[PDB]
């Protein structure tokens, strides 16, 4: 009899029940989509798109609904900050419920195809045996897929007949759903250029369609048919698995490094932005530009939005979490209440001291205040005796510019040391850690979880590909050998 | 087996089972397209990896 693993092989030579089983799987997946959407909607807080956006709240399917147009809720709110009164059918709730209904229909259909398995369509006229013409089937499915691809690229993305794609500025401050014109030049192959998306699908779609035609008319070469065992469906399984883990590695990559299809307002910022001080450099540039305009320093920093300052905080760095630290990021530091403003540190000579920022590698980091030439001017000593850089000895002051603590100065060693630790974490913010009983430890973003899940799934599917390919090519000997 | 209307309509789409083209058929053409595909993937990889500078691969 069958061992427990091999149970599912009872569907290999039964096209009808294979279809039924696939219907069941599909029903389960769509059902999961709907349910997940409902749960997220049930736990989501739309009251602050700036300091409590979706990626701070652990939303995993929300940014995907947002990415393609669904940004409104029946509750009358939006994740862009706007206020709608009637989103129509395609709100978040609408997407969820439609997915549920779809799940139900696929469920019933699965039942039917399980019951009535012996359809004449699956029989071969010459042998009365179950048979599927996999090449021609591939032709049809490729035509469907390519047509849908072309359609999605030419109408949904371009806005010719669709909502468009989530587009934002280079610093994720003005994100919204917008129509995207296709970029046909080489710049379309820029992973951060939205236009590319459109063009891609269009182009790919078209080529696919052409291929479809070919695969619909020309029979496979006998030598390729023999080599790839095109009479066995498990070869289709092998190839499909290969394609799938390829795609998985790709989306993991684009998610981690960033792309035009993984906006930071939907999935959170990247670790490399903290690595290069992306947002930090931007804020300094804007402030200096404001100084060139005649404005003062606190007037310059006051013009800086809380959002931009929030991006320059290591608590939103996806490479600071833990595998078993469950929940949203708000479960760690809390729910972001205010930007305190930019702390400037100075010694008694007037040197502008900068607190050495914590790298993503370090769970903890010594507090060191360094000048413009990277020279140690202050720190917080482990051993107190024989130390020569303590803030109590060097005499350092901290003055906030912009934010809630604007134009406040601190000269006492206690408060300066305080804001120094906090400063090693980047910009400083206010936090509500009572609502969710935060445990005071950093958690990853949806970006991190996605990248993790899909990278590992890709690896495992590399194995799956090897195994099924093996079973395909070695079908004749997979029960043993002879003499 | 059970004959149905949809099944009868879709019947010719599943009747050419086993039909193959003699020899290598269109294999060399396929190999050409495969080589071109490899070239493409390598190109976009190098663009993304900044080993091929054309177009800045930063947030635009």
């Amino acid at each position: 009899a069958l061992p427990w693993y091999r149970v599912h092989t009872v569907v290999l030579n039964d096209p009808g029940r294979l279809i039924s089983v696939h219907l069941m799987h599909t029903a389960l997946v769509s059902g999961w989509a709907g349910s997940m959407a409902l749960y997220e909607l049930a736990v989501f807080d739309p009251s602050d798109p700036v300091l409590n956006p979706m990626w701070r709240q652990g939303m995993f399917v929300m940014p995907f609904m947002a990415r393609l147009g669904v940004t409104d809720s029946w509750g009358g709110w939006s994740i862009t900050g706007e206020s709608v009164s009637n989103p129509g059918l395609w709100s978040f709730e609408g997407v969820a419920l439609t997915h549920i209904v779809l799940s139900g229909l696929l469920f019933l259909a699965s039942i039917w195809h399980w019951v009535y398995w012996d359809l004449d369509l699956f029989r071969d006229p010459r042998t009365l045996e179950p048979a599927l013409d996999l090449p021609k089937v591939f032709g049809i499915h490729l035509v469907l897929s390519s047509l849908l691809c072309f359609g999605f690229g030419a109408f949904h993305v371009t806005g010719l007949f669709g909502p468009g794609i989530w587009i934002s500025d280079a610093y994720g401050l003005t994100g919204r759903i917008q129509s995207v014109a296709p970029a046909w030049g080489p710049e379309g192959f820029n992973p951060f250029n939205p236009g590319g998306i459109a063009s891609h699908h269009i182009a790919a779609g078209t080529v696919g369609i052409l291929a479809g035609v070919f695969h619909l008319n020309v029979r496979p070469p006998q030598r390729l048919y023999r080599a790839l065992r095109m009479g066995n469906i498990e070869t289709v399984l092998s190839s499909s698995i290969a394609a799938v883990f390829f795609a998985s590695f790709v989306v993991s990559g684009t998610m981690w490094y960033g792309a035009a299809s993984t906006p930071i307002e939907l999935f959170g910022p990247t670790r490399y932005q903290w690595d290069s001080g992306y947002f930090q450099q931007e804020i300094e540039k804007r402030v200096e530009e404001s100084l060139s305009n005649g404005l003062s320093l606190p007037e310059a920093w006051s013009n800086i939005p809380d959002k931009l300052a929030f991006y320059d905080y290591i608590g939103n760095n996806p490479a600071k979490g833990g595998l078993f630290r469950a929940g949203p990021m708000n479960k760690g530091d809390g729910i972001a209440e205010a930007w305190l403003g930019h702390p400037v540190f100075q010694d008694k000579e007037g040197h502008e001291l900068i607190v050495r920022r914590m790298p993503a590698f370090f769970e903890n980091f010594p507090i060191i205040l360094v000048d413009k030439d990277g020279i140690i001017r202050a720190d917080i000593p482990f051993r107190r005796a024989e130390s020569k850089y303590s803030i109590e000895q060097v005499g350092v002051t901290c003055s906030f510019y912009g934010g809630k603590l604007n134009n406040q100065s601190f000269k006492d060693a206690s408060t300066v040391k305080k804001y120094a630790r906090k400063a090693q974490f980047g910009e400083v913010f206010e936090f509500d850690r009572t609502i969710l009983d935060s445990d005071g430890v950093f958690r990853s973003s949806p970006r991190g979880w996605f990248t993790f899940g899909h990278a590992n799934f890709a690896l495992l599917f590399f194995f799956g590909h090897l195994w099924h390919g093996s079973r395909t090519l070695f079908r004749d000997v997979f029960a043993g050998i002879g003499a | 087996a059970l004959k149905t209307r949809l099944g009868e309509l879709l019947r010719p789409l599943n009747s050419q089972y086993g039909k193959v083209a003699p020899g290598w058929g269109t294999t060399p053409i396929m190999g050409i397209f495969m080589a071109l595909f490899l070239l493409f993937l390598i190109i976009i990889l190098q663009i993304y990896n900044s080993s091929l500078i054309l177009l800045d691969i930063s947030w635009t």
């Binding site: 129509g88 059918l89 | 149905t4 209307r5 949809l6 309509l9």
Partner: peptide
């Protein structure tokens, strides 16, 4: 509007009922 979606569902349903017999 709801027109396209409703019409689409009615068409699909019509196909279903038609090929059902």
């Amino acid at each position: 509007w709801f027109a396209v979606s409703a019409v689409a569902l009615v068409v699909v349903a019509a196909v279903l009922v038609a090929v059902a017999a």
